[model samples]
Target chain A: FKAADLKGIWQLCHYVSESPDVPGALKPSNTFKVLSDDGRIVNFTIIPGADAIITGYGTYKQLTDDSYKESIEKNIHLPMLDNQDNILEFEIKDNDYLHLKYFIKSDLNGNELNTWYYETWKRVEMPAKFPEDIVR
Target chain B: KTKFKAADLKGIWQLCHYVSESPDVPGALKPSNTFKVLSDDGRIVNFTIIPGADAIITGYGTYKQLTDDSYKESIEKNIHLPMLDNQDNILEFEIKDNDYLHLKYFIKSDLNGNELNTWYYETWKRVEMPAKFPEDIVR
Candidate 1:
């Protein structure tokens, strides 16, 4: 698929457990990802009647047919993610669901850690509906 | 302010509040910032951005324009000012040169529910994506 194919808003489908060994059930979440056509990406979460949190924001570039790099600017939850280049393997199934897999490695002082990360995201239908005008 | 149409507010705006000083330095000031994403869908999200820290959510809700210079935010949640939660906040706003958005509002009580009438003012500059993302954008 073309890089443009991945340019749109996608909502996180599940809240996977932090431990990769357990591989627990997929829980529900309200996080959203805005992948602008200009290559900007934002990972945020919105509640029905509560706060909307922005976990990460940065620029992304597609490398190969199945890989992309997210150059994270500032990640709130994971400080180590800041200034990191996260390369992810992904597949857009049925042009809707995005399946992603990646690895994270960080070194804090003398401590070092490495882990795998996986995520599933569904495209958000455009022009979003709201009481106000439809936003792209 | 009329130079900017009301619809022009339907984008990202940002501001920097004072960051917490380091305990060791005592007076060393860092930069703490936040962004307000105002979508045409009427959704408004105010979230903070702190480097090497977990981003904090200020609030989120639906907003509507009442007049050219006034609008209302039907706040669903506001952690910064709990008093505004589940309440309607009317604000007067002015957009200068389609870049800076100055706003003002009033509250009858503080977060603690104590009676202290006051008016608050804030300035938010529009956030525009450059043709080329700067290498130093994050720092």
Candidate 2:
């Protein structure tokens, strides 16, 4: 997909042991990644009955059709990713599902990880109409 | 007398309004999809999330903490609302549990030249992941 194609809000989707491609039931993981065309990226999560939290903030750029890099300036959960460049290969499935693969050398606690990571993200659907009460 | 630390406001915050309450459920609150990235570097941004569309940055600028309960956002330009362009909006805020940000600001006028000398109260929440993803929110 083109760089412009990735400009939107994507939510993390956790499924059963099945592959993300043919997952059985979708799980509600309110974690989201907002990618803007202006090269800004923010990762946040919302709790069901509580307030939300910003996990990571940074800039992102597409290196190629299938590769992108996130220059994370601040990461709350994983400080090791702060001031780091995370490159990943992505596949946009049917214009909605995003499959990502990347490598990481350390974990959140700065322990040795040395493994490839995989994640599935689903594009959040826009509301049919912007709520009037929400307009400021 | 209250004293605030820079750490209290040092994170990405999203603007939200509670809406769409279920008739069966009382006092239920749902969140909107807009954000204010309050970076530690003093840069601030206000953006809206369009699910399948490109994210729209309503405003971009720098911000500074003026007092324990107040901050100022110097908006360089506001795309969605031009009236806020080059304007300095000060917000009197309180961080409850370092999560819910309750704030208010006064607007002298509106886009349609309406003399709306009124105060706008808004709430922002720190973006975070829950201990376990709940299933009730995504629907």
Per-model TM-score on C-alpha atoms: 0.49, 0.57
lDDT of 1 at B6: 48
Best by TM-score: 2
Q: How well does candidate 2 score on lDDT at residue A17? A: 55
The residue pairs found clashing in candidate 1 are: A76-B54
Predicted candidate 2 versus true structure: per-residue lDDT over B1-139, tens digit per residue: 3453433886667676655557565544445667777765677767665443333456778889898789998988876556777899898988888778888988888878999899988888777644443445542
Give the Cα RMSD of candidate 2.
7.1
Residue pairs in steric clash, candidate 2? Answer: A52-B126, A52-B127, A52-B128, A53-B126, A53-B127, A53-B128, A54-B127
Write down the DockQ of candidate 2: 0.18
| lDDT (Cα, tens digit) per residue for candidate 1, span B82-110 | 78989999989998887778899999997
Computed on alpha carbons, the lDDT of every model, listed in order, comes to 0.66, 0.72
Candidate 2 residues lying further than 4 Å off, grouped into runs, are: A1-42, A45-101, A104-136, B1-7, B20-28, B132-139
lDDT of 2 at B115: 92
